[PDB]
Paper text:
The crystal structures of the two bidomains were determined with a resolution of 1.94 and 2.55 Å for A3_A3 and A3_bGFPD respectively. A3_A3 crystallizes with one A3 subunit in the asymmetric unit. SDS-PAGE of dissolved crystals showed that they contained the intact fusion protein. The hydrodynamic radius of the bidomain A3_A3 (3.0 nm) is similar to the dimeric A3 (2.9 nm) indicating that the chimeric bidomain protein also adopts a closed bivalve conformation. The SEC-MALS and SAXS results clearly show that, at low micromolar concentration both bidomains adopt a closed bivalve conformation. This was expected for A3_A3: when not linked together the two A3 monomers dimerize with relatively high affinity (KD A3/A3 = 37 nM, ultra-centrifugation data), and in the A3_A3 bidomain, their mutual interactions are further stabilized by their proximity. However, the KD value of bA3-2 binding on A3_A3 (37 ± 6 nM) is higher than with A3 alone (without linker: 4.5 ± 7 nM), suggesting that the intramolecular link between the two binding sites stabilizes the closed form and induces a lower apparent affinity for an external ligand. It seems however clear that, if the two binding sites of the chimeric protein A3_A3 are nearly identical, the binding of a ligand on the first site will stabilize an open conformation of the bidomain structure and will facilitate the binding on the second site. The equilibria between the open and closed conformations for these bivalve proteins modulate their binding affinities for their respective ligands in a cooperative process. This is particularly clear for the A3_A3 protein, which still binds its ligand although with an apparent lower affinity than A3.
In this paper, we propose a new design of a multi-domain protein switch based on an open/closed bivalve-shell-like protein and we describe the experimental behavior of the resulting bidomain protein based on this design. Each protein member of the αRep library has the same general architecture but is endowed with a unique binding surface made by the juxtaposition of hypervariable residues. In the dimeric structure, the binding concave surfaces made from the variable residues from each monomer face each other and the dimer resembles a closed bivalve shell.
Numbering used by the authors:
A (entry chain A), B (entry chain A): 18 to 202
Write the structure that this text describes.
Amino acid sequence: PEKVEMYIKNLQDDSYYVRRAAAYALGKIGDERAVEPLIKALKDEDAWVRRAAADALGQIGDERAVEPLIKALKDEDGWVRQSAAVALGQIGDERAVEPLIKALKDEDWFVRIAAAFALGEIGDERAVEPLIKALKDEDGWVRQSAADALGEIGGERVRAAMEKLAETGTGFARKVAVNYLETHK
Amino acid sequence: PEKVEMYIKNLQDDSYYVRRAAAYALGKIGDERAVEPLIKALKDEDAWVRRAAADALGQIGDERAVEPLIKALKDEDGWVRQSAAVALGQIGDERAVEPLIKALKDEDWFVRIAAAFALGEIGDERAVEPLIKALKDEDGWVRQSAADALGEIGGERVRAAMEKLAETGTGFARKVAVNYLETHK
C-alpha cells in the first residue's frame, strides 16, 4: 500500500515490463487511485500492459472501468479481450451483457470461455439463449463454460430451455439438460 | 448446501457430465464431506472429471487432498496436471514444493504457468533458482508468471539473484531484475 504512487508513476516508464509489473502490483494493492491511470494503460502500446491493466481493473472492481473495458473487448489482441471479459465478469455490471454476448462468437476459444464465464457471473437472463447456442461450440471448454453459466443464471427461462434440450437435443447439450433436470426440483 | 449428498452420489453416475457437474458444484459449495469422494474422482475414467475434482479440492482447501493432488501432477492429461498445480497453490502446503518445481519443466506451457503461480503462492525459497531459470522459457506467459512468483516470494535470496541478473543477464530476465531493483529499498 505504501508504493501506490511509485507504481502509478511506473505506468509511464519507457520499459514495457516496468509498466506491466506496475499494473499487476496496482491490481493486487487495490487502491482506487489506480483506476484512472489503469484506464489509460488500456490503450498502452504493448499488449501485455493492456492485459495486466484490464486484469487489475477487474480486481479493483470499480464500475468506472466498465465502459473502457467494454471497449477493450474489441482489442486486436486475443488475450486483452479475454482479460477484459473476465474483468467485466468480476465487476458484475449489467451494461457488459450485450457486448459479452457478442464476444461469445469471438474467433479465439479462450475469449469465448471468458465471455460465457462473465455472463454467468453477471446473472442476466438475456444471456440464456446465446449460452444455449454455445453448447454446440467446437471447443469443449467453451461448451462446458456455457453449461456452468446456465446453471449460475438459473430461473424459469433456463428451466424451460433445459426441458426442451432434454426432450430433443443431442450430444453435449442433451447431457447438460438431463443433468439439469436431475439436480433441480 | 442442501444438495451436498445428491452431488456426492452423482460422482458415481454413469454419465461423465453428471460426475463432472457434481464435482464442480461440490467445489462451489465447499462442504468438507466432499473431500474423500473428490479424492476418489481424481482417478475417474474421464479427464474432465479429474480436472473438476482437482479444481474443487483446491477450492475446499483441505490439506488432506495434498498428497493425492501431488500424484495428479503426473496425470497423462495436461489440463488435469494444470488443475492439480493450481489447487496445490491454493492449499498452500509446502509438501507440494518439490513436485511443483518438477512441473515447471512440463511439456505443456499451461502447466508450467500453473506451477510457477503455485510456487509463488506457497512462498518457499527453494523455488527461487528454478523460477530464475523459467525466465528463459520459450513461452512468454511462463516467463511472466515466473517473474510474478519471484516477486511474491521475495526476501534476500530473490534480492541477491535480481542484483546478478541486473548486472549480467539478458533479455527478459534483465528487464525483470531491473524492475525489481527500481521497486524495492
